[PDB]
């Protein structure tokens, strides 16, 4: 994509009343937006080429 550099991204799950501490002096891709897991249940990631069909 025209770039010889690389971006390596990392993730973690932060439990309630748990604090995450960052310390960097360079090459830091700082977080801005996080995601709250507001609903847990059965789901799947489905590999398909089709799209929405407006049906049930």
């Amino acid at each position: 994509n025209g770039q010889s550099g690389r971006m390596e991204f990392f993730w973690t799950i932060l439990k309630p009343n748990d604090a995450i501490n960052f310390e960097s002096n360079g090459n830091f891709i700082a977080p801005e937006y996080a995601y709250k897991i507001v609903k847990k249940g059965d789901s799947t990631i489905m590999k398909s080429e089709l799209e929405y069909g407006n049906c049930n």
């Binding site: 799947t44 990631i45 489905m46 590999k47």
Partner: protein, 176 residues
């Protein structure tokens, strides 16, 4: 079949009997018609229904495949996951096809057995009072009206009642 009644000594089935799987055809002075045993049909229907139920939801938990993804340097586990899921699917596919094939053989032989059992039920009730024609039909040596026919159909044929009348006819036929 195994018991030799369907497509056996009874050469063909009847399209005129629609109310049951097995039955009788009577032909006396009062006319002719079809009927059903009302017992073998019920026992077969329940037996067939139980078999169909016992096949449908007996797998309990047939293997439900779940999609999993592996990166470029996890080829070994990826191939392991692919073989595992494909292995279970083949095992259950084999179980499904084989069960249908084997129970289909039993079901048809089950129908064959019921017809022969019904045929024996009538043959043993009449004993010598009728003549076995060898094609699934019996020729009475005595007069048998509609109520007499129903007695045979529901298992309450009175052998000694017509025994003397049949003995007179058997003596006449054998004497010429």
């Amino acid at each position: 079949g195994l018991f030799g009644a369907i497509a056996g000594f009874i050469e063909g089935g009847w399209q005129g009997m629609v109310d049951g799987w097995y039955g009788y055809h009577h032909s006396n002075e009062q006319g002719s018609g079809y009927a059903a045993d009302k017992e073998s049909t019920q026992k077969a229907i329940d037996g067939v229904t139980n078999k169909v139920n016992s096949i449908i939801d007996k797998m309990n938990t047939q293997f439900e495949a779940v999609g999993r993804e592996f990166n470029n340097l996890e080829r070994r586990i990826e191939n392991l996951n692919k073989k595992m899921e494909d292995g279970f699917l083949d095992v259950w596919t084999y179980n499904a096809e084989l069960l249908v094939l084997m129970e289909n053989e039993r079901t048809l032989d089950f129908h064959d057995s019921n017809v022969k059992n019904l045929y024996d039920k009538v043959r043993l009730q009449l004993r010598d009072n009728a003549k076995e024609l060898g094609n699934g039909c019996f020729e009475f040596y005595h007069k048998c009206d509609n109520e007499c026919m129903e007695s045979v159909r529901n298992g309450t044929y009175d052998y000694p009642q017509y025994s003397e009348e049949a003995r007179l006819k058997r003596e006449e036929i054998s004497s010429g």
